């Protein structure tokens, strides 16, 4: 009951945490190292983020430069962004990145409001999917007689209460996307 309880937070905490980056890998708004944070380049074997092999510098609102810590991780991370989300031809002249963002314009913010509204969903039906898997825990432990109703019926309601924080936690992340 307990376990099953400590699981759930623990799993909707992460949920949380992976929807800050998606809400983040977009701009609504203007330049900034956040974005960068979905992308990943195969270091060593392991599907590593750019934004710990770098450090993402923004000189402009138009304009980034990337420093990768390593200057062998450099094409391989140029590459990782020209192949992102963020519709950017990164350049290169040995040591740094250069990456023009755009700008944006009337349209495509409005569908990329659309956009992080769509995967604060995506988000929310993790949790609640999370959530669920701990009803058929809590519900087969009521059934196989490791406790009883009374016992189980109040986590039932504390996996819910849970739920809903987590949940208004995605709310108010898509709400500063707007």
Same mark, same amino acid.
């Given at each position: 009951?307990?376990?099953?309880?400590?699981?759930?937070?623990?799993?909707?905490?992460? +949920?949380? +945490?992976?929807?800050?980056?998606?809400?983040?890998?977009?701009?609504?708004?203007?330049?900034?190292?956040?974005?960068?944070?979905?992308?990943?380049?195969?270091?060593?074997?392991?599907?590593?983020?750019?934004?710990?092999?770098?450090?993402? %510098?923004?000189?402009?609102?138009?304009?980034?430069?990337?420093?990768?810590?390593?200057? %062998?991780?450099?094409?391989?991370?140029?590459?990782?962004?020209?192949?992102?989300?963020?519709?950017? %031809?990164?350049?290169?002249?040995?040591?740094?990145?250069?990456?023009?963002?755009?700008?944006?314009?009337? #349209?495509?913010?409005?569908?990329?409001?659309?956009?992080?509204?769509?995967?604060?969903?995506?988000?929310?039906?993790?949790?609640?999917?999370?959530?669920?898997? +701990?009803?058929? #825990?809590?519900?087969?432990?009521?059934?196989?007689?490791?406790?009883?109703?009374?016992?189980?019926?109040?986590?039932?309601?504390?996996?819910?209460?849970?739920?809903?924080?987590?949940?208004?936690?995605?709310?108010?992340?898509?709400?500063?996307?707007?």
């Amino acid at each position: 009951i307990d376990e099953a309880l400590f699981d759930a937070e623990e799993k909707m905490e992460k +949920a949380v +945490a992976v929807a800050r980056d998606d809400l983040s890998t977009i701009r609504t708004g203007r330049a900034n190292p956040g974005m960068f944070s979905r992308i990943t380049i195969d270091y060593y074997g392991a599907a590593t983020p750019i934004t710990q092999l770098a450090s993402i %510098n923004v000189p402009e609102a138009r304009l980034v430069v990337i420093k990768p810590y390593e200057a %062998n991780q450099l094409r391989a991370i140029e590459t990782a962004i020209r192949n992102s989300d963020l519709g950017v %031809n990164p350049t290169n002249d040995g040591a740094l990145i250069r990456v023009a963002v755009p700008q944006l314009t009337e #349209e495509r913010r409005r569908e990329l409001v659309k956009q992080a509204k769509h995967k604060g969903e995506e988000a929310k039906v993790s949790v609640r999917n999370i959530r669920r898997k +701990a009803m058929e #825990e809590l519900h087969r432990i009521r059934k196989e007689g490791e406790a009883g109703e009374d016992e189980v019926g109040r986590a039932e309601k504390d996996l819910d209460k849970t739920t809903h924080q987590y949940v208004t936690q995605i709310d108010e992340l898509v709400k500063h996307k707007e």
